[PDB]
């Protein structure tokens, strides 16, 4: 459960209200390919030895083209970004095994075990393609695709129903999107958060507002 994954990340079963960035606890099998022979598998996270380039990554077709001498492509961090295997001189882009950061918006664990999952920086159409939902548990398949799937600039939020109504921010997700445990059957809702009440000051050329009373108010400031 992303909630149990949150319990694994926080090292505690009592999870407070808020958003928690969880580690990728879920594991996946990687096949071993050696080509200098092994049949090439593309569009999935496999281990590779393309002319002694080592590495592990999802193999995809690459628009970028190599000069005839070049046998591989290198990235900024001196990791391999493109390869050109000797058996077939085609270019293969090295995507990493695609994981977005899983952030679990959750109310109090005591308040509810219901949770919403935000996948950061990926699109909602490609979210079962990205996190490889076909190899995981069906509990994760509930949170990878289904109903209540919303798109935020922050990423794909799955498990929170977007409401047009605007409320004070409770769990900050990002770009104005906030989530809260509200009655709508109490469930997790998501909304664009409210700045405040809209007010219009009645300015004129000869109009002033003067108070006829007051309020002696004591406020608490803790430092």
């Amino acid at each position: 459960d992303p909630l149990s994954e949150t319990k694994c990340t926080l090292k505690s079963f009592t999870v407070e209200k808020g958003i928690y960035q969880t580690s990728n606890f879920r594991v996946q099998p990687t096949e071993s390919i050696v080509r200098f022979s092994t049949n090439l598998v593309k569009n999935k996270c496999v281990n590779f030895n393309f002319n002694g380039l080592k590495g592990t990554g999802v193999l995809t077709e690459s628009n970028k083209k190599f000069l005839p001498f070049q046998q591989f492509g290198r990235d900024i961090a001196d990791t391999t970004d493109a390869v050109r295997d000797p058996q077939t001189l085609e270019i293969l882009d090295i995507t990493p095994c695609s994981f977005g950061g899983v952030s679990v918006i959750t109310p109090g664990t005591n308040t509810s075990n219901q949770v919403a999952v935000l996948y950061q920086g990926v699109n909602c159409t490609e979210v079962p393609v990205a996190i490889h939902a076909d190899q995981l548990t069906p509990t994760w398949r509930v949170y990878s695709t289904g109903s209540n799937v919303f798109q935020t600039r922050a990423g794909c939020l799955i498990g929170a129903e977007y409401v047009n109504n605007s409320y004070e921010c409770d769990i900050p997700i990002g770009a104005g999107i906030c989530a809260s445990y509200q009655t709508q059957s109490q469930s997790i809702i998501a909304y664009t958060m409210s700045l405040g009440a809209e007010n219009s000051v009645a300015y004129s050329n000869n109009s002033i507002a003067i108070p006829t009373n007051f309020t002696i108010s004591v406020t608490t400031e803790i430092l």
Binding site: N206, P211, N213
Partner: protein, 224 residues
Amino acid sequence: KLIANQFNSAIGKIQDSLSSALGKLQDVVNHNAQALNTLVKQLSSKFGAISSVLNDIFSRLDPPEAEVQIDRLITGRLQSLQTYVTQQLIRAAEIRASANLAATKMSECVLGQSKRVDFCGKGYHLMSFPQSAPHGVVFLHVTYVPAQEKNFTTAPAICHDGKAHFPREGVFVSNGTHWFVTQRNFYEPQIITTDNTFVSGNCDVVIGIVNNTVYDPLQPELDS
């Protein structure tokens, strides 16, 4: 009596708030406890050696081989303890900045009145009361928040005897037909008076100037 009753009701409201907010102090205590607990937990790390504890590495391996393994543990433990000292220095700088802010609020707000907006509460600041707190201070900012605003028709100046009259400290308002001078923060309408308003210039230079009679206190005393 209204100010005393509103102050007592506000003190009761502060009591009902606290009795039911102190997130910064508990956050500081929780960060210190979490840093000490993380420093305790980091002793379970083997740091690439065969074991986390010193004694089985001295009993198992011969002295030349241990001096590499225990050096790997010592360097890592020094790193964890350098990370802790660095994060304590950064949080101590943050607490030092907050204590400098609290000392400037205790000088400017408790020891005198402040004309700095929102430096001593939301509203017109009157005074503040300091209270002790666990590793902190709590200021009760007594503020004057003005209320019951009422619309009035206003003017910048008054034409009287071909002269422009401006208020010394206040504002011209009108209830319908009648024009008065009053203060700004509270509504106390007074008769527009030469003692209240000072004369400057002519009526042609002021934009939005209106006509009214400025009462002179010397004129009824001359008839008496």
